[PDB]
Symmetry: C2
Subunit: 121 residues, 2 copies
C-alpha cells in the first residue's frame, strides 16, 4: 500500500518480456545473480539497459538487465537467480563488470545506460 | 517495493543515549544497545521495504521497552553499503542474544517475523 521505492525503466515491456536465445551460450552464476552472454557477438556497439527499483539514490532491486546491440538485439542478460535470494547494488555492479569483460573480449564496445551509471555503475 | 512501518515518525526521529554503550558492526549493519537495561519486556520494531515476500531494505530497527523507551537499534552503516534480509536476520539474532544475556524478555514484531526473522 505505501510505496517504498521508485521503479526505473531503461527497457519497454516488449524488451522485458521478449524471448531470445544465444547462438553460442555462456552462463555464469555470479553470487545471487545469473549472467548470460551470447559468445557469437563480435565487433558490435552494445548498450546495457535495466529495469530496477531505487531507494535512497541507489539501486535496491534489479528486476532485469539486458544487453542490446544498436539494432535492438539482445546479446546478454543479468537476472536474479530463480530462488530470488537477496542481492545488493554491489552484486549488480560485479555482474555488470563480468558481463562487460566477457563482451569486450569479443571486441565489442559496451556502454551502460545513464540510469544505470547514476544508481549502480 | 512496499514500505512497512512498525514505528511512528516520532519513534523513527527520536534521539536516545545509552548508559553503558555497546556498539557492534555486524556486516553492513550497526548494532547498538544499552547494556544497563535489564529485567524488561522488549519488542523489536522496524521500518523497512519489502519486495516479493521479503525484507529488501531495512531503514531502522529499534528495540522498545513496554513503556516505549529505546534500549537498542540496528541501522545501516553510515556509508550505506547494501544488505539483504539475511544480514538483517543475523544482526537481529545478535541483538536478541545480547538483550537476553542481559535478562530481558525479547519479542519481534509480526511484520519482522513474517519478512525477515
Amino acid at each position: 500500500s505505501v510505496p517504498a521505492s521508485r521503479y526505473l525503466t531503461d527497457m519497454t515491456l516488449e524488451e522485458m518480456s521478449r524471448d531470445w536465445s544465444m547462438l553460442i551460450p555462456k552462463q555464469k552464476v555470479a553470487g545471487p545473480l545469473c549472467i548470460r552472454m551470447d559468445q557469437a557477438i563480435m565487433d558490435k556497439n552494445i548498450i546495457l539497459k535495466a529495469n530496477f527499483s531505487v531507494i535512497f539514490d541507489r539501486l535496491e532491486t534489479l528486476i532485469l538487465l539486458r544487453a542490446f546491440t544498436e539494432e535492438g538485439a539482445i546479446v546478454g542478460e543479468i537476472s536474479p537467480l530463480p530462488s530470488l535470494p537477496g542481492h545488493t547494488a554491489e552484486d549488480v555492479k560485479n555482474a555488470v563488470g563480468v558481463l562487460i569483460g566477457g563482451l569486450e573480449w569479443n571486441d565489442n564496445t559496451v556502454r551502460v545506460s545513464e540510469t544505470l551509471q547514476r544508481f549502480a555503475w
